[PDB]
Amino acid sequence: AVQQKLAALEKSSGGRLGVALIDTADNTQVLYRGDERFPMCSTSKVMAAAAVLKQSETQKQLLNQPVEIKPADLVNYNPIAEKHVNGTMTLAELSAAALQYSDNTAMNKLIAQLGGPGGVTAFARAIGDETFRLDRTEPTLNTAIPGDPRDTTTPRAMAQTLRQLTLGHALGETQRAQLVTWLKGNTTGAASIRAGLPTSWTAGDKTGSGDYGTTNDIAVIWPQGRAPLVLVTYFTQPQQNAESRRDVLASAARIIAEGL
Ligand SMILES: O=C(Nc1cccc(-c2nnn[nH]2)c1)c1cccc(C(F)(F)F)c1
Ligand SMILES: O=C(Nc1cccc(-c2nnn[nH]2)c1)c1cccc(C(F)(F)F)c1
Ligand SMILES: O=C(Nc1cccc(-c2nnn[nH]2)c1)c1cccc(C(F)(F)F)c1
Ligand SMILES: O=C(Nc1cccc(-c2nnn[nH]2)c1)c1cccc(C(F)(F)F)c1
C-alpha cells in the first residue's frame, strides 16, 4: 500500500524516486526502487566522514590533525573552507563542515585523507556495503547522468549502511555518537525528509543534489515514543537542467510516516 502511494507520488513528480526505510523496532523494510542505482551526490559525505571517524579509532589525535587549505583547493561551494584559505582546518572541522554545511572543499579533504574516492569505497566494503561506489572528487561526483554507474548506490544499501553507522557497531561508541551529533546538527535539511515528518520526530540527516534535478536525503529518525528509523529518499529527473524537488522527498517521508 505504501509502495502504491510512493508510485503515485513518483508518477506526478515527472522523475524517478527511490526509497528505503528500515524500522529498527522490528527490522522491517519498506523499499521503493530499493535495488535501483541512484547518484548519491552529497549523501556520500556521510561515508567519507564515517571513514575518517573509523581511522580516528586507531589514532586518537586524528580529528585535531591540521589540514592546509590553499586558494587552489577551493571548489564550487565552500562556505566554511573559504574562511580558512592560507590557514588550516582540523579533520573534525572538515567533517563538521562537510556534513552540516555540505562544504565541497571539506569533502575533498576527507576524500584525500582516505587516499581518494577508492578509499571511501574500501571503507564501505569493509562495513559490508557491496553496493556503494565513490569514483570521483567534488564537484564532478554530482554530474548525476542517467545510466552512469559512477558515484551511485541503491536505497536499500544506503539505508543498511546508515543503520550500521549511526545505530549499530560499524564505528566505536564515541565515534558513533559523534556522527549522530553531526547529523543532528545539519543546517541543510528542514525542507527535505524532515519536512514530511511530525515535528516531534527528532532526526539527523544529510542532503544531496546535482545535475538532472537530483535531490536526495538520508536520515536517522527518532519517532515520538518509538525505536529509531532509517530513511533514504533519492530522486532524479530526465533533463540535465531540471529544478530541485525537495518537496518530493518531504512527500515520500510523509507517506512513510503515515504508513507506520
Ligand atoms: O539490533 C538489531 N535488530 C533488532 C531489532 C529488534 C529488536 C532487537 C533486540 N531486542 N532485544 N535485543 N535486541 C534487535 C540490528 C539488526 C541488524 C543490524 C543492526 C545494526 F547494526 F544496527 F545495523 C541492528
Ligand atoms: O535482529 C535481531 N538482532 C540482530 C541480528 C543481526 C545483527 C544484529 C546486530 N548487529 N550489530 N548490532 N546488532 C542484531 C533481533 C531482533 C529481535 C529480537 C532479538 C533478540 F533479542 F535476540 F531476541 C534479536
Ligand atoms: O550550492 C548548491 N549547489 C551548487 C553549488 C555550486 C554549483 C552548482 C551548480 N553549478 N551548475 N549547476 N549547479 C550547484 C546547493 C544546492 C542545494 C543545497 C545546498 C546546501 F545548501 F548546501 F544544502 C547547496
Ligand atoms: O556541486 C554541486 N552541487 C552541490 C554542491 C554542494 C552541496 C550540494 C548539496 N548539499 N545538499 N544538497 N546539495 C550540492 C554540483 C551541481 C551541479 C553539477 C555539478 C557538476 F557535477 F560539477 F557538474 C556539481
Automatic annotation (TrEMBL):
Q: Which keywords annotate this record? A: Antibiotic resistance, Hydrolase, Plasmid, Pyrrolidone carboxylic acid, Signal
Enzyme class, broadest EC rank? hydrolase
Q: Which GO terms describe its molecular function?
A: beta-lactamase activity
Q: What SUPFAM superfamilies does this protein map onto? A: beta-lactamase/transpeptidase-like
Keyword Hydrolase recorded:
yes
Query: Residue ranges of the Beta-lactamase class A catalytic domain?
Result: 18-233
Please, one GO biological process term? beta-lactam antibiotic catabolic process
**EC number, as in UniProt:** 3.5.2.6
| Catalytic reaction annotation | a beta-lactam + H2O = a substituted beta-amino acid
The domain of life for this entry's organism is Bacteria
Tell me if Transit peptide is a UniProt keyword of this record. no
Name one matching Pfam family. Beta-lactamase2
Q: What family does the Swiss-Prot or TrEMBL record give for this protein?
A: Belongs to the class-A beta-lactamase family.
Q: Any idea what this protein is called?
A: Beta-lactamase
Source organism per entry reads Escherichia coli
User: Lineage, please?
Assistant: Bacteria, Pseudomonadati, Pseudomonadota, Gammaproteobacteria, Enterobacterales
The encoding gene: blaCTX-M-9a
